[PDB]
Coordinates of C-alpha atoms in Angstrom, one line a residue:
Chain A
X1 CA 104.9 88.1 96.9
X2 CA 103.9 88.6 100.6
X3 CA 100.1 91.2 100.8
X4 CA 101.5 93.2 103.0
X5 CA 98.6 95.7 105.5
X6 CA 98.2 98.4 104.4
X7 CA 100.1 100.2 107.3
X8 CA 102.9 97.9 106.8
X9 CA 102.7 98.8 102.5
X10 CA 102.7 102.5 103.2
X11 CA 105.4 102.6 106.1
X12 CA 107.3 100.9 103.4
X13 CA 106.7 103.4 100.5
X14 CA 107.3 106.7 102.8
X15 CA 110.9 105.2 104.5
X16 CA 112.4 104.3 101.2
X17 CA 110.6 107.2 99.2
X18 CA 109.2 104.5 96.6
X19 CA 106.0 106.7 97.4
X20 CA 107.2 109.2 94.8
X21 CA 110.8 108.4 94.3
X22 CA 111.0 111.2 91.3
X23 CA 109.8 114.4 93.5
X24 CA 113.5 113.5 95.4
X25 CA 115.0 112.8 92.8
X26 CA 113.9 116.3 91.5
X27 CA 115.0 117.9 94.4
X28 CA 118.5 116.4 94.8
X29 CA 119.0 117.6 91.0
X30 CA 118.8 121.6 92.1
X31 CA 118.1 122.3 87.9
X32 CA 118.0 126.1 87.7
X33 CA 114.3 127.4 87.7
X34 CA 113.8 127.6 84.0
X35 CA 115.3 123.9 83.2
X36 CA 113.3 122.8 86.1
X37 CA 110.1 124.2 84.7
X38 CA 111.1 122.5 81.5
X39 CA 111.9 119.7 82.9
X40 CA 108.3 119.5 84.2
X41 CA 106.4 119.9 81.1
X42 CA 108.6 117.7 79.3
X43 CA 107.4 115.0 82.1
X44 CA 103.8 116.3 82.4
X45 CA 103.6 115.6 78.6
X46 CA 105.1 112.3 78.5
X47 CA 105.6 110.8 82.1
X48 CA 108.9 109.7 82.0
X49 CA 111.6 111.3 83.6
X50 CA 115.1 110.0 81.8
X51 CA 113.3 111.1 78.4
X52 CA 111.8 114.4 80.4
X53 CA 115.9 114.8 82.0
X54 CA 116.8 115.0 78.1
X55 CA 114.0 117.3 76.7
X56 CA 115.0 119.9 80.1
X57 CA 118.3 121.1 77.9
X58 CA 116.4 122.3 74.9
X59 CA 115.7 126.1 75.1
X60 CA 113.2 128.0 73.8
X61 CA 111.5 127.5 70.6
X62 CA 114.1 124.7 70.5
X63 CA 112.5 123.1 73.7
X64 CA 109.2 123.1 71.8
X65 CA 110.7 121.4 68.5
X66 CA 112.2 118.4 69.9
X67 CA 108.9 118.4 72.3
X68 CA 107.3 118.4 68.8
X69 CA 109.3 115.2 67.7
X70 CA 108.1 113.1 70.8
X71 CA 104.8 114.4 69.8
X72 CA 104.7 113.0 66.3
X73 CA 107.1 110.2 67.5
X74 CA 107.9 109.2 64.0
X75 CA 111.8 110.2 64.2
X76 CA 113.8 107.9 66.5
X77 CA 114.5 108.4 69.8
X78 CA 118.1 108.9 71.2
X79 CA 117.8 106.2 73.4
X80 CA 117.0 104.2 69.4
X81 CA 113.1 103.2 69.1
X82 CA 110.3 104.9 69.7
X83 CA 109.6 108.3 72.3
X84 CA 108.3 106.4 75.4
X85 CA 104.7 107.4 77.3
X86 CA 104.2 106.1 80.9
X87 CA 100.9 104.7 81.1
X88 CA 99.6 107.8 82.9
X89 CA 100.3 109.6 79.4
X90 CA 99.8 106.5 76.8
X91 CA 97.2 109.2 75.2
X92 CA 99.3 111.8 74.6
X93 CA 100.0 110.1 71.0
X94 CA 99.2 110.9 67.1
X95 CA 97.5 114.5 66.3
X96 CA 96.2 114.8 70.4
X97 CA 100.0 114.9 71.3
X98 CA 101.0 117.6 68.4
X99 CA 98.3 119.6 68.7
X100 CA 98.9 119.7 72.3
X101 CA 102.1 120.6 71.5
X102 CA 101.2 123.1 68.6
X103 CA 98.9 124.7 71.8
X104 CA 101.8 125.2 73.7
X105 CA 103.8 127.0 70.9
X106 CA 101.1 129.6 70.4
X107 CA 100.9 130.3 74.2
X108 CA 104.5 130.4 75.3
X109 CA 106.1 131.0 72.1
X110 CA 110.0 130.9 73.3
X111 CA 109.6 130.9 77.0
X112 CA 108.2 126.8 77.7
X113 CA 109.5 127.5 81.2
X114 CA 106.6 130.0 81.5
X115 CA 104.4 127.5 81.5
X116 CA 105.0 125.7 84.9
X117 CA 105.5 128.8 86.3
X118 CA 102.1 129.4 85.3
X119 CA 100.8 126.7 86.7
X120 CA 102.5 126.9 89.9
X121 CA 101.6 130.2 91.1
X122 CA 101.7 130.8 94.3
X123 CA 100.1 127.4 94.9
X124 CA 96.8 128.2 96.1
X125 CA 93.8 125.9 96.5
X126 CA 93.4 122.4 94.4
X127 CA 90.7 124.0 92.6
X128 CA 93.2 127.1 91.3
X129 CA 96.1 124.8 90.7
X130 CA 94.0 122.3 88.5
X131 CA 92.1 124.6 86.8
X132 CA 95.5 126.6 85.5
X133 CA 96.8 123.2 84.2
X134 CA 93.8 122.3 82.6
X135 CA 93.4 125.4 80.4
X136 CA 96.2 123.7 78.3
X137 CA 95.5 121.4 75.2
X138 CA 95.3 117.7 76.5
X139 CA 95.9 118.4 80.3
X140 CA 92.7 116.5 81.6
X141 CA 92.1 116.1 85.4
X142 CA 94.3 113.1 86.5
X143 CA 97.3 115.1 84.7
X144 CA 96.0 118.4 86.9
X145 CA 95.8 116.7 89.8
X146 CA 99.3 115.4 89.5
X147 CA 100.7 118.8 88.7
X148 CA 98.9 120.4 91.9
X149 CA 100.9 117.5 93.6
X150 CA 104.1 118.2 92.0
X151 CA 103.8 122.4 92.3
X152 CA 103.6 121.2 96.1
X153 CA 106.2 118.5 96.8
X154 CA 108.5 119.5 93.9
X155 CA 108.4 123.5 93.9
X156 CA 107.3 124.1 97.1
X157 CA 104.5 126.2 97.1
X158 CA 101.6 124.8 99.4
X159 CA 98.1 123.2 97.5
X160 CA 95.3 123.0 99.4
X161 CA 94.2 119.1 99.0
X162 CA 90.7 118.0 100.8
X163 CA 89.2 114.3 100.8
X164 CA 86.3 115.7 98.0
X165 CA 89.4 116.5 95.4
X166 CA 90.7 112.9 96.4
X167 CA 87.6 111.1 96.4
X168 CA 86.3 112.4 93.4
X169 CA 88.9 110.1 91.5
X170 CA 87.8 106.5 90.6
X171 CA 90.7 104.6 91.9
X172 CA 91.4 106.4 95.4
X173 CA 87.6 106.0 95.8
X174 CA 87.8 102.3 95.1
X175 CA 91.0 101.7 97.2
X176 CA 89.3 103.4 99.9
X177 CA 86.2 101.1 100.1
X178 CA 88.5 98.1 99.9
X179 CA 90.3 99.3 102.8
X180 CA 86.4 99.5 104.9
X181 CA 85.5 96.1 103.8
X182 CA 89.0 94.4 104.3
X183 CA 91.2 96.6 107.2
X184 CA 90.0 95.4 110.8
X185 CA 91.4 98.1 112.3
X186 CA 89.1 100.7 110.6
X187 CA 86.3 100.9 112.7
X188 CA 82.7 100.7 112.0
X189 CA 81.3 103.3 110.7
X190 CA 78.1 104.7 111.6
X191 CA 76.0 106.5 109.5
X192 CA 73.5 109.4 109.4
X193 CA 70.6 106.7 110.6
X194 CA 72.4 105.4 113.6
X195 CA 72.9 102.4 110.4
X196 CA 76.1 101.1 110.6
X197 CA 77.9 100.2 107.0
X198 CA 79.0 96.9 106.2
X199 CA 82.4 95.6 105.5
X200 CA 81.2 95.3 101.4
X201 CA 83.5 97.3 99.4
X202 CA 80.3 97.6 97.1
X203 CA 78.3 99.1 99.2
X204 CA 80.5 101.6 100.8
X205 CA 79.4 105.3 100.2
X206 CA 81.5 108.7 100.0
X207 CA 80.5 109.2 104.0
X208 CA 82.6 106.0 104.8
X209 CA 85.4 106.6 101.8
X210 CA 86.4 110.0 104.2
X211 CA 86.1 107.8 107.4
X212 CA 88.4 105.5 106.1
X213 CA 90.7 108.6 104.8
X214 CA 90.2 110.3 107.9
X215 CA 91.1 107.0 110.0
X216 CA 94.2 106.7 107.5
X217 CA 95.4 110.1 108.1
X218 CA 95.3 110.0 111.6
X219 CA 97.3 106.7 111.2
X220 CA 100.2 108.3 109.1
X221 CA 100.5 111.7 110.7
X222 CA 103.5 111.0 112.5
X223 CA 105.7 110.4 109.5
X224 CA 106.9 113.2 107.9
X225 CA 105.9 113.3 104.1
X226 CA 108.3 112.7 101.5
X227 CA 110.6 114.1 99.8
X228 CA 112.2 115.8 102.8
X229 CA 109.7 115.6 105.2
X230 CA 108.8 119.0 105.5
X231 CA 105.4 118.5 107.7
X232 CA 103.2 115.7 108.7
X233 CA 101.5 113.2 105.8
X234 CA 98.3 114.3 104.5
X235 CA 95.7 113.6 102.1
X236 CA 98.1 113.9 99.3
X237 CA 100.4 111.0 100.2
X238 CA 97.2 108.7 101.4
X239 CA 95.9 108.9 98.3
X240 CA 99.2 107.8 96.6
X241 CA 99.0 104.9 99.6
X242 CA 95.9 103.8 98.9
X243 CA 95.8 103.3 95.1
X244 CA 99.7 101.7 95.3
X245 CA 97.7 99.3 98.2
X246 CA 95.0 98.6 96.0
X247 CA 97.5 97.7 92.8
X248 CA 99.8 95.9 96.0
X249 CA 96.8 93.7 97.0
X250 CA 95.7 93.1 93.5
X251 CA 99.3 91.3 92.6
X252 CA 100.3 94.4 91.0
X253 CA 102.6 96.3 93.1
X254 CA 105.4 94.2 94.8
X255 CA 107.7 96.4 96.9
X256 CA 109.9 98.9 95.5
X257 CA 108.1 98.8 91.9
X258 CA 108.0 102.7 91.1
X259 CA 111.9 102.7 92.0
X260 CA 112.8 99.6 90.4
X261 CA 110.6 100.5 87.1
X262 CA 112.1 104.7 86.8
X263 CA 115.9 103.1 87.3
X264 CA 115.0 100.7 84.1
X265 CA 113.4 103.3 81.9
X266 CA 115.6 106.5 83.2
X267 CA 119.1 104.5 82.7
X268 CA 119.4 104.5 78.3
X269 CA 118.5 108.2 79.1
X270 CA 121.8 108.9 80.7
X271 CA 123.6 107.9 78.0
X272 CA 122.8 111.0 76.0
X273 CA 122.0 113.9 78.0
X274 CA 123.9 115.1 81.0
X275 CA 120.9 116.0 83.3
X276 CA 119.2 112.3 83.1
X277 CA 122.6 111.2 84.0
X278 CA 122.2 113.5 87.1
X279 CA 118.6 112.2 87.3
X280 CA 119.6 108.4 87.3
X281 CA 122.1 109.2 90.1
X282 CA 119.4 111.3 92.3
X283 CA 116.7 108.7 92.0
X284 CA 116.6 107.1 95.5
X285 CA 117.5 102.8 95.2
X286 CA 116.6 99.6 96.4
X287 CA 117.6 99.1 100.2
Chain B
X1 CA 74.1 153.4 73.7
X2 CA 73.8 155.1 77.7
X3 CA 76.3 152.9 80.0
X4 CA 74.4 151.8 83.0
X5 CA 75.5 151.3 86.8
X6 CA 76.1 147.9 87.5
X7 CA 73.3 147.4 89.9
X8 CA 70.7 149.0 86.7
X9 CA 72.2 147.1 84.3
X10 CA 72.0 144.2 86.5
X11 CA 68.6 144.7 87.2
X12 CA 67.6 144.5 83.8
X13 CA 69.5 141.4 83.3
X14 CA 67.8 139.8 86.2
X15 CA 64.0 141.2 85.3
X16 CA 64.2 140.6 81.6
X17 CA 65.9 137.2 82.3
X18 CA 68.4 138.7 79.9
X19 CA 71.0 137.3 82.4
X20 CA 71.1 133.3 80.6
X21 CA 67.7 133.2 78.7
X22 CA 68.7 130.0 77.1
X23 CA 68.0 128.5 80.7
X24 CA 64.6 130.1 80.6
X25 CA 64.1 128.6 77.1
X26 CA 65.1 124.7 78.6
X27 CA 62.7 124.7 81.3
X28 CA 59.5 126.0 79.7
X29 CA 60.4 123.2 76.5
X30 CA 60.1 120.9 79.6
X31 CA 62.4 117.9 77.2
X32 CA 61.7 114.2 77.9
X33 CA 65.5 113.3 80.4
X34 CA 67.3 111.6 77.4
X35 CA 66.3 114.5 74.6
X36 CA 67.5 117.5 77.1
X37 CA 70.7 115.3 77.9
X38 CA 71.4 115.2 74.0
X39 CA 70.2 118.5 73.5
X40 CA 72.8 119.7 76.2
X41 CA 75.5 117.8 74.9
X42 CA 75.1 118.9 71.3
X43 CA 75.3 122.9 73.1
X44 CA 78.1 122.4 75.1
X45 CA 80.1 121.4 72.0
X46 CA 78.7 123.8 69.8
X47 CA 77.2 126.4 71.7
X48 CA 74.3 127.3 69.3
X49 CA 71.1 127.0 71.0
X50 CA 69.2 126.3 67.6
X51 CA 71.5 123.6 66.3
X52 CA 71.6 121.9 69.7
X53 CA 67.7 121.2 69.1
X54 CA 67.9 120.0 65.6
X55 CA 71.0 117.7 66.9
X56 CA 69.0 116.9 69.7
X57 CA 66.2 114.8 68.5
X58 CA 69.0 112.2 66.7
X59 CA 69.3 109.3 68.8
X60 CA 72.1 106.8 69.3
X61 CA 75.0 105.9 67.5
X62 CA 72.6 108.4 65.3
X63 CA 73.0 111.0 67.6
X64 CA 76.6 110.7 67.6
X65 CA 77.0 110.6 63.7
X66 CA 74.8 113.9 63.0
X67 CA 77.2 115.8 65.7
X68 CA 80.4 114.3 63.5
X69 CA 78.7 115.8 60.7
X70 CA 78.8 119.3 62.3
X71 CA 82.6 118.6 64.4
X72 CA 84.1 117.9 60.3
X73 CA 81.9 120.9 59.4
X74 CA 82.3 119.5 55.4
X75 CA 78.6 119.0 54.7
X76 CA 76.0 121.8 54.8
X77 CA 74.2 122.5 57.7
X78 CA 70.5 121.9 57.2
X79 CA 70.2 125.8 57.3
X80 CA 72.6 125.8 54.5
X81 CA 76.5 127.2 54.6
X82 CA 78.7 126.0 57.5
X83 CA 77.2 124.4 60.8
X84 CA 77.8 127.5 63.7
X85 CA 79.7 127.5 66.6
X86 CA 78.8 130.1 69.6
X87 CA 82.1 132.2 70.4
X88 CA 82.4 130.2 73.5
X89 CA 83.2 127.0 72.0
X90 CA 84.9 128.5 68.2
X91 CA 87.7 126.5 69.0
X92 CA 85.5 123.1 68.3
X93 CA 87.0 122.5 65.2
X94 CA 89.0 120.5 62.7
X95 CA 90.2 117.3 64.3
X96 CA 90.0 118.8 67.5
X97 CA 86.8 118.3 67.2
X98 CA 86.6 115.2 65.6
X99 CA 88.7 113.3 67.9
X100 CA 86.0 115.0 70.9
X101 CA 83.6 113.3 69.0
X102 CA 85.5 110.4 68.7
X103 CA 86.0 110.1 72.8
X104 CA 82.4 110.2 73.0
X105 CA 81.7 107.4 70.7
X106 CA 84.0 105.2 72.8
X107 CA 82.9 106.0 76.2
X108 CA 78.9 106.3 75.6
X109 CA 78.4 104.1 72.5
X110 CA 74.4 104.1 71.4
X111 CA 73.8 106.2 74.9
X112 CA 74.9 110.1 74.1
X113 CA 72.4 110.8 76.8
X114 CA 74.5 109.4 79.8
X115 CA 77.1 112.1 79.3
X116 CA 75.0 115.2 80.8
X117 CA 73.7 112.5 83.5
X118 CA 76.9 111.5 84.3
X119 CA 78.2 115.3 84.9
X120 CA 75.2 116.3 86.7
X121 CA 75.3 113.0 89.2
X122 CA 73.2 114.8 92.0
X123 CA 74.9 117.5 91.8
X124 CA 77.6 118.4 94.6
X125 CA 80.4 121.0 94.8
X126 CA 81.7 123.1 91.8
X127 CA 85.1 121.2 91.7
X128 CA 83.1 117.9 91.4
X129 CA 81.1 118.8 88.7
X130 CA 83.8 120.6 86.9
X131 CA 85.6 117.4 87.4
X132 CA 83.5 115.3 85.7
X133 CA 82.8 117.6 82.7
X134 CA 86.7 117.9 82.3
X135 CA 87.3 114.0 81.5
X136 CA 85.7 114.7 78.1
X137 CA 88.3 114.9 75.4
X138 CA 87.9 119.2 74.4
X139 CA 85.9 120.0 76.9
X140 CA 88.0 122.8 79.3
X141 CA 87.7 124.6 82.5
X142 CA 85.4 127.5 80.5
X143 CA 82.6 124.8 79.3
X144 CA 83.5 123.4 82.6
X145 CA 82.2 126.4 84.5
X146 CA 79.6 126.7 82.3
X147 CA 78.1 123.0 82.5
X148 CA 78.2 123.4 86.1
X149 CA 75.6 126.4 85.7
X150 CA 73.7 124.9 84.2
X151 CA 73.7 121.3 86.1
X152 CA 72.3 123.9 88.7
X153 CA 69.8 126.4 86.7
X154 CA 68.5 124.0 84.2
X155 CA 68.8 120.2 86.2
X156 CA 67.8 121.1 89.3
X157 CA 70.8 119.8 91.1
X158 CA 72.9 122.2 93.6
X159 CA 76.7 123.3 92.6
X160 CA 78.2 125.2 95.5
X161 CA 80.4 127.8 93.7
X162 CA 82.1 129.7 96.2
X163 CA 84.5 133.1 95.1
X164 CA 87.5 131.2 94.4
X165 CA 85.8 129.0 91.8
X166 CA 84.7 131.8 89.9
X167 CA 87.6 134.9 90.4
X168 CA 89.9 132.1 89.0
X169 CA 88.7 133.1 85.9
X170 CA 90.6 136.4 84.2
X171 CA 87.7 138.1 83.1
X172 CA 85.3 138.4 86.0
X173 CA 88.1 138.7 88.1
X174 CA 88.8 142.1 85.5
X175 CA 85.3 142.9 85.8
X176 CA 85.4 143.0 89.4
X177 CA 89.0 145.3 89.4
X178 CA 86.8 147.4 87.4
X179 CA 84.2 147.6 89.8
X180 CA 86.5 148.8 92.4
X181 CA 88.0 151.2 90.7
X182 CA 84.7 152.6 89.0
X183 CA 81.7 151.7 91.7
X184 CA 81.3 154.8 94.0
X185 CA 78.5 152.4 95.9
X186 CA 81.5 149.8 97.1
X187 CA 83.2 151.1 100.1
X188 CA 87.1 151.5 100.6
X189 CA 88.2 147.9 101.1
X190 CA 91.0 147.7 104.5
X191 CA 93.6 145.6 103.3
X192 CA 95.7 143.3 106.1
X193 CA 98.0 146.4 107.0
X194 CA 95.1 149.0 107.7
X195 CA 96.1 150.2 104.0
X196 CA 93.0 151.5 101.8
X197 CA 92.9 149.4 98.4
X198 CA 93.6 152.0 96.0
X199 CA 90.8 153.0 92.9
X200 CA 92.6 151.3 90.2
X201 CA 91.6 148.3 88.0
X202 CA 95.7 147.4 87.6
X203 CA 96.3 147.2 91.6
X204 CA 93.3 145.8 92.6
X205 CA 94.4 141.9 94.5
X206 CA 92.1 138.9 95.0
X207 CA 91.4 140.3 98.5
X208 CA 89.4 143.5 97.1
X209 CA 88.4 141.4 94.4
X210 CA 86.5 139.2 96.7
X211 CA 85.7 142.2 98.9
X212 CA 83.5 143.9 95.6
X213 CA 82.2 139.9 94.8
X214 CA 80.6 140.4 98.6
X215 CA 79.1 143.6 97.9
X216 CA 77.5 143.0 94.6
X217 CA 75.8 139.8 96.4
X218 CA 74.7 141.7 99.3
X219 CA 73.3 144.2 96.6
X220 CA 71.4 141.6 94.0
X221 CA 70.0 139.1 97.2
X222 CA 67.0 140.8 97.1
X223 CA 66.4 139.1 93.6
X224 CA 65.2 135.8 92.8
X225 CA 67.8 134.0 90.4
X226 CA 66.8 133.1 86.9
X227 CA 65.1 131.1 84.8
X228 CA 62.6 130.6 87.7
X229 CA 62.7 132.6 90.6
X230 CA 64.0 129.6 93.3
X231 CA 65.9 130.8 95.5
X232 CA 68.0 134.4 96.3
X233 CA 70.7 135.2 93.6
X234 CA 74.2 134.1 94.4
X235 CA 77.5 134.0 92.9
X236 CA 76.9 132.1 89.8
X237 CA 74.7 134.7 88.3
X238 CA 76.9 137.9 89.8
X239 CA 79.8 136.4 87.6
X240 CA 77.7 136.8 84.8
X241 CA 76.9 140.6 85.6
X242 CA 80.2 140.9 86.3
X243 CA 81.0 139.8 83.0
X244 CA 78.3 141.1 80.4
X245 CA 78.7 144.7 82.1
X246 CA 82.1 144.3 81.9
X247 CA 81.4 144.6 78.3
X248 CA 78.5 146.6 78.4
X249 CA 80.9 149.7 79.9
X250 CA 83.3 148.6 76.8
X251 CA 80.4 149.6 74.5
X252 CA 80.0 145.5 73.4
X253 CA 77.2 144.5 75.5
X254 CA 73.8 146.9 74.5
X255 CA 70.5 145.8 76.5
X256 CA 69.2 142.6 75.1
X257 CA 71.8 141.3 73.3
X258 CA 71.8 138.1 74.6
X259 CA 68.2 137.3 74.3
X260 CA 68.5 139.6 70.5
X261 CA 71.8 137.3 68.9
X262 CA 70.3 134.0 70.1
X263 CA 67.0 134.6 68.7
X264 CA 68.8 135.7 65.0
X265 CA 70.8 132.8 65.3
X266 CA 68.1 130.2 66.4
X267 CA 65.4 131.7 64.0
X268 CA 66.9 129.5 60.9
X269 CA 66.9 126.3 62.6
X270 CA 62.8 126.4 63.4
X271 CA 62.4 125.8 59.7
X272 CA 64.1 122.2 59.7
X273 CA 63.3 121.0 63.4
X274 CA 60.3 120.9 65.7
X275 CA 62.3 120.9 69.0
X276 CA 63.9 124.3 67.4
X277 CA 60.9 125.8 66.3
X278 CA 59.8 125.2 70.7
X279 CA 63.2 126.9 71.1
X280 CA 62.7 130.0 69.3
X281 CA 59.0 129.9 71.1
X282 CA 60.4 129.6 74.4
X283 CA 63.2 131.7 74.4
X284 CA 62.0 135.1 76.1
X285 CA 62.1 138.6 74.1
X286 CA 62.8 142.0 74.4
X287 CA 60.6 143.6 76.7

C-alpha cells in the first residue's frame, strides 16, 4: 500500500474514527453504568471487545467467574477455541491472568463494576488516573495509560495528558523522532546551544520529541477529537497518530486496520451475547 | 508512650535521621555502582535491609538465582527459618513472586544491576520514574513511590514530587485530614466559597489537604533533608512525617522505631555477610 504523510494518515484516522473506532462504538451502545464499567474491565483484562461485549452481562460474583474462565482459558470459548488476548494483553495468560483475577475477587467481591468506577474518579491528572489503575494485580503502565485514555474519551471525565506522560513511552518517543528526521515540514529545531538537531531519528533527544509533538498538535487542533468531537485534538490522539504512523510507514498499518481487524474478531461474538451484537452494529465501518 | 506534636515528633525524625535511616546506612557503605544496584534491587523486592546485603554481593545469573531462592521461600535462609519480607513488600510471595523473578531474568539476563540504573536514568519527574519502576512484573505504585525516594536520597538524581504525586496515596492523605482536624498551629483553610474547612478528619477535601501539605513544608524548611543535609526538606520527607506520626498518635510508632526494628532485623544477617555486617555498622542508633 501507498506511505501516506503523516497529516494525510492522521486526517484519515480522525474522519473515519479508525483512530479508536471502539471508544464510538462504546458510546453509541449507551450500556447502563454498571454493565459499562463491566464492560471495561472485561476489555482492560483481555483487549477485545466482542469477548469483553459478552463478559459485560455477567453480574456480580458471576461477572468474576466466567472472568475467571478466560483467565485459566482451559474451558472453551463460546465463540469454540480458546479465550482471545489482543496483543496489548497477550500477557495476561496462565497463573498472572488468575491471580489477577483472584486480586480482583478479594477487592470488589460482588460489585466488579466498582472497579472502573474506581478508576475513573472524577478524572483528575494522568498521574492520579494511572496510579489508581495500577494498584490492581497485572495493570502495568501501558494498560494505565490506556484506561486514563478511555475514563476520558469513553466516560467523560477530563485526564490531564502532557507530552512527559506521552514521551515517556517507547514507541510514541520513537514515532516522534521518525517524524524530525523524515517530515519536511517540521522545522528545524534549535537547541539550548543555538545547535541545531539533525534530521537522524537516532540522534533526536526528548527537547526535539516535544517539538515535533508540539508542531503536531498545532497541526491537528482544528479537528475535533473523536468520538464526538467534543474539543480540539490533543496530546492524547497525537500520540495514537504517531505510533499508528510509525506501524503505517513500517508496512504495518494499511488504512482502516483497527476497524477492519475489531469487525473480524467482534463478529463470532455476536452470535452469543446480545450486547456484542449491539457492539458489532455500533463499531463505525469501512467508507 | 507521650504523643508528640507533629512539628516535635518531626524534629526528632529529622535530627536523629530516624526519618529513612536505611538511606543514611547506603551512603556511608559508599557500594561500588553495580553492588548498590543489586543491593537495591534485592530491597525493593524484599524490603529487609540485612538480606538485601547478603543478596547483594551475588552476581549474575547468580544474583538472580539466590533472589529465586528467597521469592520460593522453600530453603532456609542463611539466618535459618524463612527468608523475611519488610511489611511493605509481604505480598512478594508464592508465584507472585516467582514469576517477578522470572521477568527479571528475561529482561536483565547476567546484568541484575541495570534494573536500579535503568529506573534511576538521570532522574526526572516523579511520574517518570515511577513509570519506569512500574514496568517490572510485582512491582506497584507503593514500591513505586518508594524507589523514586530513593533514586533521589540515595542516587543522587532529582525526582520532582509535587502534592498530587504524594496525597494520591490514602494514608498520608489521612494523615494530613488528621492534621487539620488536630493541629491548632495550621490556620483555618478558606475554601472556594469563603466557607471555613471544618475541624474534622472525615470532611477534610484535597483542597485543605494540600493547604496543611503547605504548612507543614513552610514549617520543616528550616531543616536540611536526610541522610546528608543537601538541600531544604521538601515534600518527599513531609509524607513520611505525615505518615509515621500518623501512627505515632495511633500509639504504633514510639521514638526510634525505625532505626530500633531495622537494626533487630539486620543484626542476624552480619553473621553470614560482610556487606551486612557494614549495614548494621552504618545504620545510625538511638541517640
Amino acid at each position: 500500500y501507498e506511505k501516506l504523510s503523516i497529516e494525510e494518515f492522521g486526517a484519515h484516522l480522525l474522519g473515519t474514527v479508525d483512530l479508536d473506532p471502539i471508544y464510538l462504538a462504546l458510546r453509541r451502545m449507551e450500556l447502563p453504568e454498571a454493565q459499562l464499567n463491566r464492560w471495561l474491565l472485561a476489555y482492560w483484562c483481555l483487549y477485545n471487545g466482542g469477548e469483553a461485549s459478552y463478559l459485560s452481562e455477567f453480574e456480580g460474583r458471576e461477572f468474576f467467574e466466567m472472568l475467571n474462565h478466560a483467565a485459566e482459558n482451559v474451558r472453551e470459548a463460546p465463540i469454540g477455541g480458546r479465550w482471545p488476548r489482543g496483543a496489548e494483553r497477550r500477557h495476561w495468560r496462565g497463573a498472572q491472568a488468575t491471580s489477577s483475577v483472584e486480586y480482583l475477587i478479594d477487592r470488589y467481591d460482588d460489585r466488579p463494576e466498582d472497579m472502573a468506577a474506581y478508576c475513573a474518579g472524577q478524572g483528575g491528572t494522568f498521574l492520579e488516573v494511572t496510579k489508581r489503575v495500577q494498584e490492581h494485580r497485572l495493570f502495568g503502565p501501558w494498560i494505565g495509560f490506556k484506561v486514563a485514555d478511555m475514563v476520558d474519551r469513553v466516560l467523560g471525565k477530563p485526564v490531564s495528558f502532557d507530552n512527559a506522560a506521552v514521551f515517556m513511552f517507547k514507541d510514541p518517543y520513537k514515532a516522534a523522532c521518525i517524524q524530525y528526521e523524515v517530515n519536511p515540514n517540521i522545522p528545524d529545531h534549535v537547541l539550548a546551544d543555538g545547535s541545531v538537531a539533525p534530521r537522524n531519528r537516532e540522534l533526536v533527544t526528548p527537547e526535539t520529541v516535544h517539538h515535533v509533538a508540539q508542531h503536531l498538535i498545532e497541526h491537528f487542533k482544528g479537528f475535533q477529537a473523536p468520538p464526538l468531537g467534543d474539543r480540539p485534538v490533543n496530546i492524547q490522539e497525537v500520540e495514537t497518530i504517531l505510533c499508528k504512523w510509525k506501524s503505517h510507514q513500517n508496512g504495518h498499518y494499511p488504512l482502516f486496520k483497527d476497524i477492519v481487524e475489531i469487525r473480524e474478531a467482534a463478529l463470532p461474538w455476536a452470535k452469543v451475547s446480545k450486547t456484542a451484537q449491539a457492539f458489532f452494529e455500533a463499531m463505525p465501518e469501512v467508507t
